[PDB]
Design a protein around this ligand. Structure first.
Ligand code: MET
Ligand code: NI
Length: 404
């Protein structure tokens, strides 16, 4: 398939140019320049790499707006846990379909998940069309995890590598909900299976433990997506630079739950790899990485207007996120995955046209025209070609009545 006759943004460091993109077998066969014969004329629009959300809890879309004006401890143990106790397998599936509907409308091609009923979340990802690194949330009590690691292993056995779109990793919740012995066991397991780990790290100010413990259990040799890192001591930035450590910056959630602002600019200046995540819809309420990216840029600029430039922001939301997830995406080049997004330039916020890249970060509404993954359209002009919208909406309505 050849889509083009419009502006093309190869990557975060490139300039938009008029051309087209030829896709075959889910990959980019070649990038054409200028006036060329195309199958799909997208004149008046922009084609760029798709985005990658490095932190979420997909089914939480079913809890959007249920836990407001609460501190973290109240949010989790008072409001969220009781409701999650009623969240069924069927609900996990549809909640994930809903999460993908929302994320796809914002140009997201893949996401990293940490939750339960992960097999049904995987089925939803399979059916909808996105890519994903799925992990099971792990917590324990003196080594007893109620079978959570076992469930994560079942998930791995059945879904890791599925269609080159789904990968499986391990999701220890945090260094405080996981005992030291158990966290070590989780890392040993991930290391043995050469699988990634994702965890909430230094999200709250109460977390004052030393990172040496985790640095000696496998953090150096296991690809780890560390969400938040708001209170991560700067003395560790240097050692985290040359290891497969990816920060997942969740600005909205960090503010909403009163945790603060992560020192992203300093982390980047130290050579650390940083990506963007949304967290769940109950503590952000939106699953929009454009919003997340923009907010991130603004928060760092509070200290210095030169912080987080446009190219760096675009790099984090596309290439860096794909890198964290282990996918050859984030750039429109030959041999790379056909994960692309189309943005309408015929909008007030996209003028002057000579500043398109800047608008993507500081003005763009966030609503894309279309999203493609593996060469397939998962969102196009307000519609979801891979699912039965009416059916899904009816099921979601029944779920709201059933859950609440
Ligand atoms: C993000 S899932 C965290 C663990 C979950 N609360 C459980 O009890 O399994
Ligand atoms: Ni989270």
């Amino acid at each position: 398939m050849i889509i083009g006759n419009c502006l093309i943004l190869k990557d975060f460091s490139s300039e938009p140019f008029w051309g087209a993109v030829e896709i075959e077998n889910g990959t980019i066969k070649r990038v054409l320049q200028g006036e060329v014969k195309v199958d799909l004329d997208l004149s008046g629009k922009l084609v760029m790499p798709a985005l990658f959300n490095t932190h979420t809890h997909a089914p939480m879309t079913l809890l959007r707006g249920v836990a407001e004006d609460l501190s973290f401890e109240e949010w989790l143990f008072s409001k969220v846990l009781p409701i999650e106790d009623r969240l069924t397998e069927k609900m996990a599936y549809y909640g994930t379909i809903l999460a993908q509907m929302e994320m796809a409308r914002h140009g997201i091609a893949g996401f990293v998940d940490m939750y339960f009923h992960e097999e049904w979340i995987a089925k939803a990802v399979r059916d909808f069309g996105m890519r994903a690194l799925l992990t099971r949330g792990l917590v324990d009590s003196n080594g007893d995890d109620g079978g959570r690691l076992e469930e994560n292993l079942k998930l791995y056995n059945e879904w890791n590598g599925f269609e080159g779109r789904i990968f499986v990793g391990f999701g220890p919740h945090s260094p405080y909900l996981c005992s030291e012995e158990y966290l070590k066991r989780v890392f040993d397991t991930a290391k043995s299976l050469n699988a990634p780990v994702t965890i909430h790290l230094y999200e709250t100010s109460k977390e004052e433990y030393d990172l040496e413990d985790i640095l000696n259990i496998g953090l150096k040799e296991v690809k780890t997506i560390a969400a938040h890192c708001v209170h991560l001591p700067e003395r560790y930035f240097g050692v985290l630079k040359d290891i497969p450590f990816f920060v997942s910056h969740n600005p909205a959630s960090n503010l909403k739950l009163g945790n603060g602002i992560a020192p992203v600019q300093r982390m980047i200046e130290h050579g650390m790899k940083v990506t963007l995540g949304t967290d769940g819809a109950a503590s952000n309420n939106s699953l929009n990485l454009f919003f997340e990216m923009r907010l991130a840029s603004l928060l760092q600029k509070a200290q210095n207007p030169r912080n987080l430039d446009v190219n760096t922001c675009l790099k984090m939301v596309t290439y860096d996120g794909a890198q964290a997830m282990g996918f050859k995406s984030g750039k429109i080049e030959e041999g790379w995955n056909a994960d692309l997004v189309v943005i309408d330039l015929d909008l007030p916020e996209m003028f002057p046209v000579q500043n398109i890249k800047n608008h993507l970060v500081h003005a763009f509404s966030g609503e894309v025209f279309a999203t493609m993954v593996a060469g397939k359209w998962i969102y196009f002009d307000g519609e979801y070609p891979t699912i039965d919208s009416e059916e899904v909406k009816r099921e979601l309505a029944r779920i709201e009545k059933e859950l609440y």
